[PDB]
Amino acid sequence: EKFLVIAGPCAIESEELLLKVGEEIKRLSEKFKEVEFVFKSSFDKANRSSIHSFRGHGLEYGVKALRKVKEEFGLKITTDIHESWQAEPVAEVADIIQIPAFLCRQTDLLLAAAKTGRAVNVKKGQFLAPWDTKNVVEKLKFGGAKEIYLTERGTTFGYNNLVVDFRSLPIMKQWAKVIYDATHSVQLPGGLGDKSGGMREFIFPLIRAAVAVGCDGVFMETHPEPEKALSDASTQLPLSQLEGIIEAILEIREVASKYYETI
Amino acid sequence: KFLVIAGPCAIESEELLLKVGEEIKRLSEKFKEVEFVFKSSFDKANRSSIHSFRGHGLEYGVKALRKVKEEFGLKITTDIHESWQAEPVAEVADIIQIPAFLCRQTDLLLAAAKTGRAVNVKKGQFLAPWDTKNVVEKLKFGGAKEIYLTERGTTFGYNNLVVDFRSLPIMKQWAKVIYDATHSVQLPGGMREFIFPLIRAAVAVGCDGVFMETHPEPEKALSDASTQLPLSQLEGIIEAILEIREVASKYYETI
Amino acid sequence: EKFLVIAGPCAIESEELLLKVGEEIKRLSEKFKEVEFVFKSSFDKANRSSIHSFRGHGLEYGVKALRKVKEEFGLKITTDIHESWQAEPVAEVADIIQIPAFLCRQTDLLLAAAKTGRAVNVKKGQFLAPWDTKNVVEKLKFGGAKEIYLTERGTTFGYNNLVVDFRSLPIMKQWAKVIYDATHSVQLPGGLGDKSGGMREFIFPLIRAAVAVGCDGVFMETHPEPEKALSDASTQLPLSQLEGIIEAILEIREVASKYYETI
Amino acid sequence: KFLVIAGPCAIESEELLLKVGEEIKRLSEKFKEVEFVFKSSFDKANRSSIHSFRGHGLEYGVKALRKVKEEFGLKITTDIHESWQAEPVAEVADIIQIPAFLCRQTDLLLAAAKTGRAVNVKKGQFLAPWDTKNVVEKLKFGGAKEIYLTERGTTFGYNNLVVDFRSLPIMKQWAKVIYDATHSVQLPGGMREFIFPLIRAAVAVGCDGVFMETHPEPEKALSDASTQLPLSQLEGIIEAILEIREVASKYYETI
Numbered sequence A, C: 001e002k003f004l005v006i007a008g009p010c011a012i013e014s015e016e017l018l019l020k021v022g023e024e025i026k027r028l029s030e031k032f033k034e035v036e037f038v039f040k041s042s043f044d045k046a047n048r049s050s051i052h053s054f055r056g057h058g059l060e061y062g063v064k065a066l067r068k069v070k071e072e073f074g075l076k077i078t079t080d081i082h083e084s085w086q087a088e089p090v091a092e093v094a095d096i097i098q099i100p101a102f103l104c105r106q107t108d109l110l111l112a113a114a115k116t117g118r119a120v121n122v123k124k125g126q127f128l129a130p131w132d133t134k135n136v137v138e139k140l141k142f143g144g145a146k147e148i149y150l151t152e153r154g155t156t157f158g159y160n161n162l163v164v165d166f167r168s169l170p171i172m173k174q175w176a177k178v179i180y181d182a183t184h185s186v187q188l189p190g191g192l193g194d195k196s197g198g199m200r201e202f203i204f205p206l207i208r209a210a211v212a213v214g215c216d217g218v219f220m221e222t223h224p225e226p227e228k229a230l231s232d233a234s235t236q237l238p239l240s241q242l243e244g245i246i247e248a249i250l251e252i253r254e255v256a257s258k259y260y261e262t263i
Numbered sequence B, D: 001k002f003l004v005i006a007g008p009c010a011i012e013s014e015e016l017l018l019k020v021g022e023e024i025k026r027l028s029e030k031f032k033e034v035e036f037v038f039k040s041s042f043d044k045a046n047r048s049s050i051h052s053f054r055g056h057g058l059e060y061g062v063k064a065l066r067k068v069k070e071e072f073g074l075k076i077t078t079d080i081h082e083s084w085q086a087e088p089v090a091e092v093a094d095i096i097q098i099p100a101f102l103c104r105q106t107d108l109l110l111a112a113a114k115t116g117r118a119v120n121v122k123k124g125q126f127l128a129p130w131d132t133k134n135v136v137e138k139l140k141f142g143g144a145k146e147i148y149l150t151e152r153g154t155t156f157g158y159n160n161l162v163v164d165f166r167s168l169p170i171m172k173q174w175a176k177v178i179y180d181a182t183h184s185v186q187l188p189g190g191m192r193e194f195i196f197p198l199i200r201a202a203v204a205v206g207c208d209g210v211f212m213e214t215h216p217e218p219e220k221a222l223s224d225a226s227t228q229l230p231l232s233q234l235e236g237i238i239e240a241i242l243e244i245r246e247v248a249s250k251y252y253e254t255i
């Protein structure tokens, strides 16, 4: 089955930033034809730690920008919703509706996404055990969702730290396709006080682990200049490094693939 | 004065609310030192299973809560799950409660603050104590003035919560602190035997109030059946924490 | 039953330091007659993080100093052992043989302590669940121990941090007398790199919690001048504060006592 | 070269060691790229229960280990639990193993280092990756030159261990890193289905070797019966990690 690579700037800082990243993702989609690329970017960071942090330019502007990306590059689109009413308007452009980690248990949000007929990707809550995602998938199926993904993005490990329990990949695979969030899994929640931290040096090794274990795709935030990002400046991958990372995981995936266990 | 937020987990029927309301009213008259607040959720919006009990809706809920405040003159508190709910809930709720999983949802916090009512934020199981400072700042920015932070356990491995009591003195630096005695012993995805022991710890450490779910027959509750406190045991526990508080308060550290 | 207060300098820095602390503990034992005091001090810090940290002046010197304390003040004595051969010589002076947290699973050490006929106090390993201490007590009883204590000293919570799960007090009470370690429970393992850290501001509130929940005693390291201690300088309680802390926990214990659950 | 430490958890009988030794010898000849080390404990000194299997003693153990090295010419490794054991164990053990619970016991580390042999320290479930720097320093101070640090999981709530793979690159800054594939999936006080998946992760991330407990019939093992790898599956797993390593090594980060 075609491997999924969900990538793009964390937040829709501007329609320009989106077209700049979209151009590169389009180039890579032409090179890595065995990969199904999905362009991602949030129209709103509705859960920043500080009230003073960047959130976005609203849904209207965001959907418009995302539609421009899909229109210009013919790339699939995914973005996250935060309240039920957003599912309908977002579904007009998003091929995959993403459910934020903190909201993975909000029944009405999951149901709102499911009835749009679009694919739904739920970030696994940092408080959730792998086996408890079975009910999350059940809610979605109940709500009409036919294409469901569960994304591993780390688990609460003491204060301001997340650990990735790779046992979660084969467990969740029992009831949904699994995506590994390579950039959020290394962030340090509220690590910088008014904002979260992160250790970029661990992004690559952990993503290698993910494909070695076996997953159906990877999620990576990428920005031309991470140091200047308005969100997740410590974890967003420099855009020029994307190509090399993807080649590497496809290589590791291939050699490890024959050993992937059957669920 | 010391706050005691109590009531049935879910509004299974205004009839149930009135029964629990009668007992809380009685205790209210017996313990004038304490400020009681009746609590009950009009919707369990985050159940693990799609087939579990959620409730009878916001309208039926706000109505039942109205009956309690009118019939007993008790302050009210219930939780909201989406921004639009803040306004209609504020009609009856003296304190608007923010769910633990939603403690970082900026719009929900702002919506609650904008109603002018008091806001009680359940500290997320993923949050460090010091990270609640920013939560308070959001509410203040939104015009909130009576702000509470509730300790309800922290993620400890899978399907388990631990109460780090160091959180009480830490959160007290920027808000009044409430200890959730019933959800702190619950096992995500709980043991009633630990409710009283940990509540005693909370008052010995020092907090501004306690939160307890109580039901005439917990075994038959449609929500938190394993942790809801039997109504008949509420008086004894309140008297107990008041006595412990009286002696221990002498040692509560300043700010 | 008489409440136990185990207190003293973390390490036997000198026989003088011991007599200075012993004098105060003796004074308090005369005041708090409802308390059973036990003077504690390690003849060896066998598990310091750094090879450059203070360990002690050897068993011989240590036992001699401890015997002087017992001789001069008539105070009961407790100290910890690290290898089986130490149980015999230590048992000559120690009324209670303490088993280090990291060694709570070492069968031969527990057995060595048990056959001396002395009381045995096992620090609960930071890796151990409360219910798993049942087997620890079983080993001791098997080895002849008649007076057994289990000490709560925190549990691993993420990196370089410990949390106290007070549910452990009533659980462990099912099979042994329970002691709360008020000073080690707030230490930050390897927090200072070459040494462990700690937050003294939390010692008092957590000890109040312990007696409110209910335990059979408390363990506190105290030093005339903590800032100058050769070990646990960040967590040892200033000696002048001991009296007040003890009065407070006896007061809280008394008012909470009628609510202690029966096991 | 890549290290593969394997063998039965406990020395249930030198007869068992010889059987496992024969297979490890065969693989040894098949994979010249790998340096195999036969492992087996002469004593399980930290069992939870007093009634569990410990072993046949140090003498019977060192004797059986001698038979394996002589009969197959395989390097040896076993763990010590008290200082006095270092010297006699060093007679046969090429690598002296330090138990996880004992990774901070200074005298045990010094005793092992003093024998001149290589020392492999199991990282305690309570240790942070960066805290192993001091462990290495102790061994160096003691005269050790071939030092290994083994990843075997970290305490995650109660009765559970999680493998934080960030530890591999971190510990590599001051020592060769070995991944314990069998104890990392064990549940303190485990699931065999996760052994292979996590070992693949370890080599994809980058390590200097793997540690695996293998037994002809794990179901009948007197120790770690739920996690010991069936002997017949060892060849397949080794071939698998060699292939993954070959491709992934290209991306291992420097130091």
Ligand SMILES: O=C[C@H](O)[C@H](O)[C@H](O)COP(=O)(O)O
Pocket: A045, A047, A048, A049, A050, A053, A100, A101, A184, A187, A189, A190, A194, A195, A196, A197, A231, A232
């Ligand atoms: O959903 C949350 C995102 O993944 C981040 O971890 C989030 O936006 C980080 O927020 P902050 O830096 O404001 O803590």
Ligand SMILES: O=C[C@H](O)[C@H](O)[C@H](O)COP(=O)(O)O
Pocket: C045, C047, C048, C049, C050, C053, C100, C101, C184, C187, C189, C190, C194, C195, C196, C197, C231, C232
């Ligand atoms: O047994 C260990 C003691 O309680 C300490 O936590 C220990 O001696 C601290 O050692 P260090 O400061 O050298 O890490």
